[PDB]
Amino acid sequence: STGSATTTPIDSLDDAYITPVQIGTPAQTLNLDFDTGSSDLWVFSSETTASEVDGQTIYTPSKSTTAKLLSGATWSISYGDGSSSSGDVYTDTVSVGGLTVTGQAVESAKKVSSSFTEDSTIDGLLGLAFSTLNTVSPTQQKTFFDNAKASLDSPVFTADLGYHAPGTYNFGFIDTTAYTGSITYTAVSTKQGFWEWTSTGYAVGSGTFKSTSIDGIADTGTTLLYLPATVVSAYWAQVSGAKSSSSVGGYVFPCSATLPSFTFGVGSARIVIPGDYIDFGPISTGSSSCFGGIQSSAGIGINIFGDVALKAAFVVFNGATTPTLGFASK
Template sequence: MKVLCFLGFIALVAASPAPIHKRGVYKVERVPNPNYTGRNGPRALLKTLRKYRMPIPDGLMDAVAKADIEMISRRQIGSSRVRRQATNTTGAAALAAAGNTTAGAAATGVGLVTATPEQNDVEYLSPVDIGGQTLNLDFDSGSSDLWVFSSQLSTAATTGHTVYDPNKSQSFALIQGATFSISYGDGSGAAGNVGTDTVNLGGATVTKQAVELATAVSQSFVEDTNNNGLLGLAFSKLNTVKPAQQKTFFDNVMPSLAEPVFTADLKKAAVGSYEFGRVDAAKFTGAMTFVPVNTTQGFWQFTSEKFAVGTGAVQTSVAGSQAIADTGTTLILAEPAVARAYYAQVPNAVNDAQAGGFVFPCNSNLPDLMLDIGGTMAKVSGSDINFAQVDAQNCFGGMQATPANLQIYGDIFFKSNFVAFNGGNSSLGFAPHA
């Protein structure tokens, strides 16, 4: 997601990808997941900092270890918090059902599949068909690799996972010598070889799409048995395949879409979707605002130099400050001036090094936060900023201060806003959810 750590080896150029469905609209729905055992605020913050190569504040590693131990203890005694209304399928069963659910909409040019947010909106997973095999992948607008758990991994690494087996696909072709190696924020990563295959995302289909087959994955991915890989939706210049970068699924499928866009409708505790090919006006209120995106670094990046707390006056944080819209990040990392001003309006909120960041009493009535998106203000609901419980009284803030000159707006931003990514003119659109 990020300024990624790119490790490369040797590869050859893949055959030109070929989209095979023309002028379509394709939708990937998400549903709530009740298989929820609690969030880890310090770990979510650490993941984002590492993902973007940002400095790690003193004390954060200790806070992560402490939160890990407390979460394990809560799970062992059967304690679970913040259970939300959901469907009657749970956990792996819900994901399995998602992988088998498609709408018979081929005749109308609309594809539909379900998608399930893991750990209650911490990570969004969607079923993707690769060479006739369905895997649940994490859609990430902050990275540009499509990699999967493959049959080349050891049994120990794949236990509980659905794996992609190139030998079971009639359309797979190996790119001789091509490799990928990618590292994400929490130190997690994957590496392996590369081929091409037909990739179908709810009806949006590309033949000869680069698919990166993991031969090594980090332990955190091994333990996350719901997730079988990532589908990157940033710009292709971030792709890690060597020696020749490969195009993302979105770049390849754009010519076949009714409009060169995809949208993220990631509302909290309600059915949402990723949709390719249109901006559905029924999903938002008012007029959608589009702002230009700076693609220099390969991200969906824009200026964000102003903010407001609740109904207060608009303030300037840092002139020229930049931010990234990242569906693969959970938290919001904002300029320190924004974080300080926001939590100053929350009674008894403190920046607690032992907890890893800003914390506040869990029963706080949090104000809304207004963020500058390319010159227009967007609201983040205060209720979404109450992210995770730290102890019996205190909660960890879903908005923290960035230690670098870059702001990251993750899923907490998306929960309040319907967002459109326009690849045709490199712009980002947003409006409040309907």
């Protein structure tokens, strides 16, 4: 089997992407944030504290004839950005772009933190990291991809995120029309439960490539590119007027400035992030100070190849017995 779904930016800045997901019988369609950095499929629901729901579409398990309470199960998650949610668990039928999993754990939120309430466009998350990170207790549950894997034509999914435009998540096949050149595959460590890999280096604009190992995660659920402070400093030093603002919480730059591209290495291959992808607009409405899309990972404890990086590539998440990641230009 295969599936194919369009993913759409939630706003004009590509702060996140939402993909429609059918849950239950009859189908209830929710727009979920596909997150290769986590491993829980959780949704706003009829069980979510009323004051914490503000425009989201909810899953109502009592209206699904295929929903079954996962008795005794609870879940609770905290994300790198400080947000969190928790609740109980049902199993139900979940379909993405034509691909159907029966008995998928659907984690129903009883509580969500303010950032989730305040974002009316995201109805939940669909985790695509390794199932070892799943927070359901007492019995850890599998991701949608893990459940689908054996049925797929090939045990892979691909992320093809758009710049200021829709893109595509595919399951079970590689669309050879969706990228240029070849796909370069690189080793993955699953030891922390992430799609963790090692970039071979970077270049800033037309500068020479610096060969240096950068360990990080391919994370569709993180907006920006977070890299070591040395790398980030070298980038922003090429932007006139850029500075790191402690009050804002990262590098900002005058919108009148031209942003250089940023190149990262995948083996001997190179992915070029165009300068425009690194512009995240005014820090506040009407401000001439713009927020940068490449920021320091210092104090995150890991480097994160978030959407800024991934949207410059066609990315293969290969769930073969020994997982790997593939990157192509597009």
